Amino acid sequence: SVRIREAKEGDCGDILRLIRELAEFEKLKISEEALRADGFGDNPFYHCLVAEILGPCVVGYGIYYFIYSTWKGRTIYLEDIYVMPEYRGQGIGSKIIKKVAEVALDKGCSQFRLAVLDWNQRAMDLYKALGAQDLTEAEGWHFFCFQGEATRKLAG
Amino acid sequence: ASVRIREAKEGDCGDILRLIRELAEFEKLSDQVKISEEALRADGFGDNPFYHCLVAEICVVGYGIYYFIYSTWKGRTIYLEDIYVMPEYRGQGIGSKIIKKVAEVALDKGCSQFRLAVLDWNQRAMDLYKALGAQDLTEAEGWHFFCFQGEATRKLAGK
Ligand SMILES: CC(=O)SCCNC(=O)CCNC(=O)[C@H](O)C(C)(C)COP(=O)(O)OP(=O)(O)OC[C@H]1O[C@@H](n2cnc3c(N)ncnc32)[C@H](O)[C@@H]1OP(=O)(O)O
């Protein structure tokens, strides 16, 4: 059986390995130390869920944080979600998503957001199957990012 | 018109909501505004705020709402969630002043990643952002914005 649960500091090694797997899957600077500090700190920057087979082994994860919508208020953003290849298509990713929804309601967040690459149609299809809307396709939203000098020029 | 851009205070939340509702009403989407003044107060002005807000003041005539995010690709990032200026005050550079200020906040915190979403009708904005060195990630990289809205979320959570 599989359980989705809050990460503990002891999971940081396993989580770092899985972050590296998802980064490679997506085709492109965090230490185990940074994870422990940022993900559990005071003051945590983000929150991690692990999928664990019941010794027990961690086979997937999600990372989310709290954001905001001006129409709806408190919102969660699901940043990373990943299940190891051997463990895909046995409901684990859907269970991680359901857990994020449960956490959302528990924390007074009516809705949750994510970003996904348009080549990743199997993921997009799952999110649509679970009730999500593609607002890029529906409304025309384009993500922009300024880095380094671009942000400096933006700041005039 | 003479305008200042300043940090919002808890007492500006009535005005922020009035502006959000004015936009929604303009778009014929009034029924979609579920946020409350009490939420803007609680979510913005307690110990761990969900957002930060700059207002444009002559009468508050505009706002920019942002928050920080942690991207597993680039680390700490500022994300501009929304900028609105009342139509009567459009053409006066107020929106440009707000975005400039948000960019300065990022830099002041020692963060140089800035992210936002822009609607595709807004060619003026898109052209300027590219000219400044920004990348359109949707066009460049195929990023799509997904949202599990209220009904979908409740269903997933087993209601
Ligand atoms: C928000 C951002 O992080 S988007 C990034 C999403 N992450 C990835 O694409 C990493 C690689 N893939 C995975 O981690 C997983 O396959 C996930 C998270 C996408 C889906 O989780 P799983 O446990 O495999 O899926 P689950 O069993 O809950 O089933 C749903 C669907 O997954 C999708 N899927 C993606 N890859 C597979 C796969 N290898 N095998 C079976 N289904 C897959 C399909 O849409 C399937 O739908 P269907 O049953 O109607 O045919």
Curated annotation (Swiss-Prot), chain A:
It is found in: Cytoplasm. GO terms for molecular function: diamine N-acetyltransferase activity; identical protein binding; N-acetyltransferase activity. Transmembrane segments: none annotated. PROSITE patterns: GNAT. It is an enzyme of class 2 (transferase). Its EC number is 2.3.1.-, 2.3.1.57. Keywords: Acetylation, Acyltransferase, Cytoplasm, Transferase. The keyword tRNA-binding does not apply. Signal peptide: none annotated. Acetyl-CoA binds at I81, Y82, V83, G89, Q90, G91, I92, G93, S94, N120, Q121, R122, Y127. Homodimer. This is Thialysine N-epsilon-acetyltransferase. The gene is SAT2.
